[PDB]
């Protein structure tokens, strides 16, 4: 889900400039949820903007943001020309994991049939059922099935039983969160508090951006405890200021790079155009707009695939020195010594991030000599897996906010393990709560299906492995071999990308099929698993990854001349075993596509369809073998008329149950 | 693929009776699959059996054993009434590897046009190219494309170049195997050694059964290295009469006798003058042991298929797995196979379960309760990937090897890998005498009875129960776990009747089969204790029905796989009453929200889901760590019924190896 609100204080904006700012903000957040959207602004058509802050208009519609963008426009009642000197507008895109994605369930929610309080919520309230029964007895009627509505009907209940006639908007929100259980990121708007916003979070991201041509009164807002000119953030001499509430930074970078990342239970409140926190550091974001633009590509997923030569280079920047063959991950300098005294490595993650652990498990075992265990986070938790004080637990999460991965982290901390975060988002929960960690530095990933995150995690774990063995004489040559492979890896990725048209042709032969089996073993077990997941996610074909050594134990019965098959056969120590699996497939009349090395003349002669990739080091070849399957999934989705950036039934980053 | 030989020594038998015994032997060996079969026996119609010992007749044919039987009795020149006081007959079913199926490529292979030496073979001789060239240069002409013919020609080469006129049959065979490379089980017969048999193996099972109405000299045959007298071989004491049965599977011997000798690699067993000695190039020896197998255990009975039998007899196979091991009277578990090692095992620091296919799923299905009751790290590894990665193993690891057959190559090689690194090894097998049961430090026979069906059904549930019993042993000294142990053991007490209850819903499963009859895919979703149920059911439906069933971990749906859900994709979800119930309900709401209309396997009393879901398979509730046995059986039956509807033969393997090398 996504949160975005635009508060222009004494910065005249017409009702069109505002709605186009809310929609544009949701477009920056759409990748976090695109099942429905909605906006909440001030209604009325009075020239004097002051007489309009008592009327709240809600425009909510099912579908992506573009469905709401048209619903907002071509309306017969809203006059888009009213100039507002002060105005607050809130917006929200929803990932409807439950129920119907109807406008009634979309946000902003309301507290009554006159819109006295409207709230946009990211998260879950684990006790909304109890809150629902309490509010219904007092005389409140519910309309939607969402847990967010209980937050709107409750902020009004605290307002209908206040002690003084002018209790601050903060005090009302404070009494609400004290009754809410679970995680949430909230942004309130009320007719009684015109222009005033309140932003509180608990286990969910929520920052506040600020723009103003004038100087700001401070760069460290002091948190308060139940508010003068030496306490609030505001322009000194004048009042011109623009705020940007948002659950992510991509929705604010376009307007400003000065945000204030809140913290759990911090109740921010903009009053009279002054930001004050209740219960900070105005900082510059280290992000360029170009990082979240498609550039000259028609989709984010395509950009992020073809930019892997660059994102791989950025992952190694300032960390790999090829002149002297040294590896230094600054994030682990203070802990690498104690990590080596531990006795087991555990990798915990979900989805594609879990595959990154599978793809590097073997080389981690080789260079550390430690037992390495790779766990799906959801099953890790279900089994109450045993963890000990001398375990080193890695948590792979591009977003750094995945629910199951994050709960596994707190589980391992409680048991005394040493925790390490491999993330792509700075300031994320997983990056903060681990003892140490590494930012893979692949840049923002906007596509729902992870591509560069996978290859960057891959490289990051290999660099860690290289540190763990830099004192072993017997492993020096093996280290050099791997590092030379990394030096040559960016260009070899470019070579794979130059086969784009040859992949697209093979896709024209498969798009009509219902299933495809992707078979590999050893280093390329993860490759066939990740490729199957990618084809599932964006093409909707029933693709499954099968461990090649397991074919003879049952799954081979499914192969006939009609079943499409993709096999991975690389020139490593399992080559002969992979050739035997291939012969078993052919015996069953299978006609597979084989991803193989360019020099594998034997395979190239005896197979019609081959995808010939350049040879790298055996423990890096998985990066080159997966890219064709990224490209194949892309072209298949295009051939089938589907969107590669907005696959049905889900969104990016699972931060709730 | 199947070997059987019958040696009657001073037990008079007619030619008919001998041939009927050979045919019947091969019939017990068909379930493994084959493409041709043949028999070898003494020819000639001289009423005095002593003179017919120099004429070996062969009858080999491509096709089923039944066709071979018709060919046997369809011989106008053969008199089936001659009585033989001494005779050796050999039989074989072939699964072609070298040379296409044909009469010439069928066994027994011969050494010359006069059949001076014949041999039956299971396996592959790797160096059969080099051996064939050598024998050709010495003046031996080959007539088949099989690697086996090199064996028959080579033994005649050793005989032709023997140093003394009375070199033993054993010595010749020893010289043969010392030149062979690969895997083999062999039985030899020759006109120069009438009435004698030689059997040897390397990487392929070979056993010998024995029957006699007289007392036998010993029950422990001592090995002889390079004197054969009355103190070194097996024989009836006061009389000569005795019968011997060579076989590659005990299923072909059990109806005649339950006293067997399992041979080991590079053993050369010889019967000379009705006495059995074991040669090999304190004192080591081979035991004559008693098998608890019965002919009834390998017969369909009233069932129409072995798959159906082995599914519906699971209430009895579970009981057999627990017999003598669980005392419900006082809530105690005792696996006698671990008595001399349970102490060491409890001092180790990690459990590793290594297996393939459904046996691997048995480890996944019990990983959680093993972690709970042992409190040790439990790692479950697919044997093939375990080997590819050179996984780290240590002297304080306990490694379990799960294998119904006890012969799977990758599992066996994983075992030898762990033994070299000093780990304590444990075999969980269902086949006495198998390689994995022998080479492990200790083990448990799951005692489910032989599995004749192509797919693993009772083996999976018996492995399941066996690992639960081991877990119950590991925590028997913990005061805090007494209640939990009792709960689990009262679940085992009630499990046989709960299985019958599930099997009584067969009709409901058939209705589900008709719904999926025309479907090409189905997703099976579950988590926790029922992750293994999803994987195992998905594999069954793939293996038996040949449709694309896939197991999906429910907690992973929102990470990608949920994109496959729509109004057309068939989905089966498992929702049981355990600690993951709420999370499973959540996954169900996620599927329905995207137009999915899944079939739900749930508890009989889950009134909420039964009402909100159209088709539900309602199984009885049991302990959470045992429910996996009840939830997998409906998927066993579904695979069975779908296959029948589609006209498939569930007892037909299909899954063949690589193509035949014609050369
Ligand atoms: O293509 C699939 C997605 O990339 C998905 O599998 C993702 O990896 C997880 O849903 C969360 O992983 P992160 O925590 O790294 O975002
Ligand atoms: O339906 C499953 C098959 O029976 C197969 O997957 C089997 O489980 C493996 O081939 C391992 O065999 P073993 O258990 O005999 O080692
Ligand atoms: N390799 C031998 C025997 C194969 C077997 O049945 O095991 C052949 O093909 O004739």
Author numbering:
A (entry chain B): 2 to 227, 241 to 293, 304 to 681
B (entry chain A): 2 to 227, 240 to 294, 300 to 681
Please quote the authors directly.
GFAT contains two domains: the glutaminase domain responsible for releasing ammonia in the hydrolysis of l-Gln to l-Glu and the isomerase/transferase domain, which catalyzes both the isomerization of Frc6P to d-glucose-6-phosphate (Glc6P) as well as the transfer of ammonia to Glc6P to produce GlcN6P. The active sites of the two domains are linked by an ammonia channel, which forms when GFAT engages with both of its substrates, l-Gln and Frc6P.
GFAT-1 was crystallized in the presence of its substrate Frc6P and the product l-Glu. The product L-Glu is bound to the glutaminase active site in one monomer (monomer A), but is absent in the second monomer (monomer B). Here, in the presence of the product l-Glu, the Q-loop (residues 95–102) covers the glutaminase site, as observed in the isolated glutaminase domain from E. coli. In addition, there is a conformational change of the neighboring R-loop (residues 31–36). l-Glu-induced shifts of the Q- and R-loops trigger side chain rotations of Tyr35 (R-loop) and Trp96 (Q-loop), destabilizing the C-loop. Although both active sites are occupied by ligands in monomer A, no ammonia channel connecting the glutaminase and the isomerase site is formed.
